[PDB]
Every structure is written in C-alpha cells, then in structure tokens.
Swiss-Prot record:
Biological processes, Gene Ontology terms: cellular detoxification; cellular response to hydrogen peroxide; cellular response to hypoxia; fatty acid transport
The UniProt record lists the keyword Magnesium: no
One Pfam family of this chain: Lipocalin_7
Superkingdom to which the source organism belongs: Eukaryota
Modified residues (Phosphothreonine): T51
Gene assigned in the entry: FABP1
Keywords: Acetylation, Cytoplasm, Lipid-binding, Phosphoprotein, Transport
Name of this protein: Fatty acid-binding protein, liver
UniProt keyword Phosphoprotein, yes or no: yes
Length: 129
C-alpha cells in the first residue's frame, strides 16, 4: 500500500515545452498549464491503479510491476511498456523515449519525465484519504 492515496499538484516545471514536444494539442496545453491536477493511486502488492484528473481530462491506468502493461499517455496514445519498482517508494518506466520516475517521500510524490534535454518535473502533496 506504499503509494496508495490521493495527491494534488503543488508545482511543475516545463509543462508547455514538454507537452508541445510530445504532441499535445496546443489548446489543451493552454487550458492545462495552470491546472493543479489530482492523482489517485491504489496499490495492492504489485498491482497498481492510478487515475489522473486535470480539468475534465481523466486518465485511468493500471499495471502490474514487472509485467507488460498498456499505459494511456498525455495525448491519448496507448503504449506497451513495463513499470518497475526501484525500492518500495519508486516507480520507473520508459515509453516513447521518455523516462518517467515517480518517487514518494512521505506525503510528497515527485514525478520526473525526461525526453532528451527536456526535464518535466511535477511535485504533488497528499490531500486527505
Ligand atoms: C479540458 C482542459 C484540460 C486540459 C487537459 C490537461 C492535459 C495535461 C496533462 C498533464 C498530465 C501530466 C502527465 C502525467 C504525469 C504522471 O502522473 O505520470
Ligand atoms: C499519463 C502518463 C502515464 C504515466 C506513466 C507512469 C506510470 C507509473 C506511475 C504511476 C503513478 C503516477 C503518480 C502521479 C504523479 C503526478 O500526478 O505527478
Ligand atoms: Ba513506504
Ligand atoms: Ba519500455
């Protein structure tokens, strides 16, 4: 249950640059850049379910650690990949040349996505139960 909970974005870096590079429609970039998105994670052993809500955009994903999964990304593109744990508190995957690291430290989840020189970093904080 390490990751389980509800978290909301506190701050992020390089949203616009990153989203434009990956092919997000620009009117979604514009509507989305200042939204404080909410992430709901449910972990049960190796099985994870996560929902990410950013203003009427709702992305629901599931995966088993160390198994092939199909992740729906920012644009709607579904990608086959493997998510690994690197310790109890860290989720790592790569897709479309993007390295995604999700790290929980107490109540703060730091998500770092790097595509080439672009490092997109999001900091979220637990919000209740
Ligand atoms: C309908 C207007 C809202 C605009 C849609 C917002 C789309 C922006 C997507 C940002 C989500 C960040 C990617 C998830 C990172 C992660 O949790 O792994
Ligand atoms: C929509 C982008 C796909 C995300 C791929 C990463 C899969 C493992 C991480 C799942 C937990 C995500 C936690 C959300 C953190 C955040 O909203 O910034
Ligand atoms: Ba823990
Ligand atoms: Ba991969």
């Amino acid at each position: 249950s390490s990751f389980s909970g509800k978290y909301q974005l506190q701050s992020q870096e390089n949203f616009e640059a990153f989203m434009k590079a990956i092919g997000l429609p620009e009117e979604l970039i514009q509507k989305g850049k200042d939204i404080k998105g909410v992430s709901e994670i449910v972990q049960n052993g190796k099985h994870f379910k996560f929902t990410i809500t950013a203003g009427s955009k709702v992305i629901q994903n599931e995966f088993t650690v160390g198994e092939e999964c199909e992740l729906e990304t920012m644009t709607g593109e579904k990608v086959k990949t493997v998510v690994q744990l690197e310790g109890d508190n860290k989720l790592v995957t790569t897709f479309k040349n993007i390295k995604s690291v999700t790290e929980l430290n107490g109540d703060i989840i730091t998500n770092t996505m790097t595509l080439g020189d672009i490092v997109f970093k999001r900091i979220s904080k637990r919000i209740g139960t």
